[PDB]
Ligand SMILES: *C[C@@]1(O)C[C@@H](C(=O)O)C[C@@H](O)[C@@H]1O
């Protein structure tokens with residue numbers, strides 16, 4: 001394991017790190033959420049750009065990123081446009097996705113970016129290189145909102161992300177059975193124990209999958225998402241309750 | 253599913269039931285522990301009879317059971333002599349083990365007894381029948397303190413307990429790896445999905461297995477052990493922390 005350290009937070013050792021997502025339409029809503037989040041306890045702030053209205057303007061997007069950065073100057077900040085292709089709130093062209101991510105990277109405003117593996121090989125490789133050249137980490141991600149692939153398929157995907165230079169491979173899948181939750185845990189453990197040389201994040205979604213959000217220290221997921229007031233994906237629980245469980249498991 | 257209702261507690265529905273073990277070496281210590289346990293919060297009290305150092309006397313054993321019952325008149329009370337063969341504190345003859353269990357049964361002081369599956373089929377059947385004749389439920393049990401059998405063999409054993417008339421089959425196994433914990437969860441789920449005729453209790457022991465003590469609601473373990481002050485098996489955590497996690501998982 002080589003860890004990923006952002007603003008004194010060490011991802012990939014100790015207790016899994018808590019990520020929460022900020023979701024807002026516009027500058028005023030982003031400010032209101034950032035302010036409300038001061039009362040919560042978490043490790044990493046993800047800005048879910050796909051919840052923002054004016055994603056067409058690179059200037060509008062960067063202004064919002066700047067507001068968030070300045071609101072929370074000492075928090076690791078992760079920039080994520082979750083495409084509708086992968087379960088997000090709106091569509092984007094591959095070219096405009098590239099433009100927004102490059103602009104986020106070279107602005108200095110973010111510590112980490114999410115890059116969807118399935119975007120396309122040339123765009124992924126170029127964006128990984130661009131991120132690294134500007135001292136930004138890449139969470140390379142994949143999501144299946146309908147079903148859970150085989151463990152073999154999931155492990156190969158996480159390995160592919162590593163081979164493409166992801167700092168943190170990430171996969172989220174939807175269980176259709178309790179068995180599918182075990183498949184996700186099995187894949188996570190296999191990856192972490194046998195192939196990974198860096199942190200990985202995994203989750204099985206929905207209430208059925210929630211154990212996967214709690215047991216990362218055991219099965220090898222380095223971070224986990226909680227909800228401040230609204231979940232950013234199915235299965236997230238109240239962030240304080242998430243923290244309570246993580247602490248109990250860490251100290252067991 | 254044939255649930256087991258004891259003093260208004262429905263075992264096999266809702267949150268896994270919290271069991272704690274009372275371990276006292278003599279009558280005075282049993283009394284002191286029973287009194288102290290009243291303020292802890294749990295669902296079922298197990299008396300670990302093999303920790304009692306006056307098991308030579310049937311009178312002494314029954315007097316200790318009566319002290320516990322008098323301290324906790326409304327708590328489901330489980331009488332367990334854990335044999336040295338299966339990880340307990342002392343060795344007694346098979347006839348001594350059976351006599352203590354029969355005396356516990358016919359005293360009316362306890363609601364449930366633990367009977368080890370591999371005591372011998374004829375003796376197990378006879379003692380189950382005697383329990384049922386006196387309105388006592390049987391937790392039939394098996395323990396592997398060395399390692400984790402195959403999922404398939406664990407399921408076979410739980411099904412054998414069902415065939416012998418157990419009210420609640422129970423198996424505890426020792427992980428040698430994180431993978432082994434998943435094996436135990438897999439066996440548990442296979443009972444829930446395919447062999448769900450009565451409640452089952454399962455656990456993977458030690459620190460690596462702790463998640464199995466927390467995730468019973470997900471995969472189908474009907475009860476889970478916590479520690480009041482000292483653990484009665486490896487991997488048990490503080491009972492209030494156990495309860496906190498069970499509640500979070502139940503309400504997720
Ligand atoms: C990584 C990610 O897709 C995981 C979601 C989850 O399942 O918790 C939350 C999203 O906000 C996040 O981008």
Ligand SMILES: *C[C@@]1(O)C[C@@H](C(=O)O)C[C@@H](O)[C@@H]1O
Pocket residue numbers: 273298300332334366393395422424455457477484485486488
């Ligand atoms: C059933 C049993 O053997 C399970 C142990 C455990 O692993 O928590 C605790 C024992 O006291 C109990 O009899």
